[PDB]
Amino acid sequence: MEFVAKLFKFFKDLLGKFLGN
Amino acid sequence: MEFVAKLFKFFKDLLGKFLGNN
Amino acid sequence: MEFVAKLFKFFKDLLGKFLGN
Amino acid sequence: MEFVAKLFKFFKDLLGKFLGN
């Protein structure tokens, strides 16, 4: 499961730099 | 932007390759 | 006139490929 | 990214000296 924890961290952080801030 | 239009297109490749084909 | 038409044409052709969505 | 943010800066510029003040 630790894999997906790293995965989401990459996903949500990347999109985070993109949407409304 | 086309840059985005392919970013997700790149994600779909990663995820399907990362978690499982099905 | 032809000038403005040509200028807009040039801008759109050069830039639409960039925003090639 | 910064492209779109710059784009509107160009649009308002284009519109500025096009239509007037």
XYZ file of C-alpha atoms in Angstrom:
85
model
C 0.000 0.000 0.000
C 2.967 2.276 0.632
C 3.329 2.489 -3.157
C 0.024 4.274 -3.652
C 0.831 6.635 -0.783
C 3.839 7.805 -2.771
C 1.767 7.766 -5.955
C -0.996 10.052 -4.718
C 1.588 12.384 -3.193
C 3.011 12.806 -6.677
C -0.425 13.186 -8.261
C -2.098 15.619 -5.890
C 1.024 17.747 -5.507
C 1.506 18.072 -9.254
C -2.094 19.016 -9.989
C -1.921 21.219 -6.903
C 0.575 23.506 -8.620
C -1.970 23.842 -11.428
C -5.528 24.527 -10.265
C -6.716 27.605 -8.396
C -4.186 28.789 -5.838
C -2.967 24.201 -23.672
C -1.701 21.208 -25.630
C 0.841 20.748 -22.851
C -2.022 19.843 -20.521
C -3.948 17.960 -23.209
C -1.157 15.401 -23.092
C -0.231 15.548 -19.402
C -3.344 13.621 -18.413
C -2.800 11.556 -21.552
C 0.535 10.724 -19.953
C -1.098 10.017 -16.587
C -3.498 7.443 -18.022
C -0.415 5.641 -19.284
C 1.362 5.757 -15.927
C -1.624 4.695 -13.830
C -2.702 1.827 -16.065
C 0.907 0.688 -16.120
C 1.382 1.300 -12.407
C -1.649 -0.275 -10.726
C -3.005 -2.852 -13.152
C -4.180 -3.409 -16.710
C -7.662 -4.275 -15.430
C -8.217 46.100 -44.851
C -5.899 43.485 -46.266
C -3.235 44.484 -43.741
C -5.253 43.782 -40.602
C -6.764 40.651 -42.126
C -3.303 39.345 -42.953
C -1.962 40.224 -39.511
C -4.773 38.439 -37.691
C -4.396 35.490 -40.053
C -0.694 35.287 -39.258
C -1.274 35.507 -35.510
C -3.976 32.853 -35.512
C -2.027 30.407 -37.651
C 1.167 30.834 -35.651
C -0.537 30.619 -32.265
C -3.415 28.170 -32.686
C -0.937 25.363 -33.241
C 0.554 26.330 -29.889
C -2.840 26.099 -28.169
C -3.488 23.085 -30.330
C -6.165 21.669 -28.044
C 1.331 27.703 -16.887
C 2.562 31.260 -17.420
C 1.531 31.138 -21.088
C -2.159 31.865 -20.548
C -1.371 34.516 -17.934
C 0.793 36.269 -20.505
C -1.799 35.727 -23.232
C -4.397 37.967 -21.615
C -1.690 40.574 -21.094
C -1.257 40.538 -24.863
C -4.989 40.552 -25.584
C -5.600 43.654 -23.480
C -2.605 45.225 -25.210
C -3.959 44.338 -28.651
C -7.398 45.643 -27.727
C -5.864 48.764 -26.211
C -4.278 50.335 -29.275
C -6.903 48.741 -31.523
C -10.162 50.194 -30.214
C -8.703 53.089 -28.261
C -9.173 54.401 -24.753
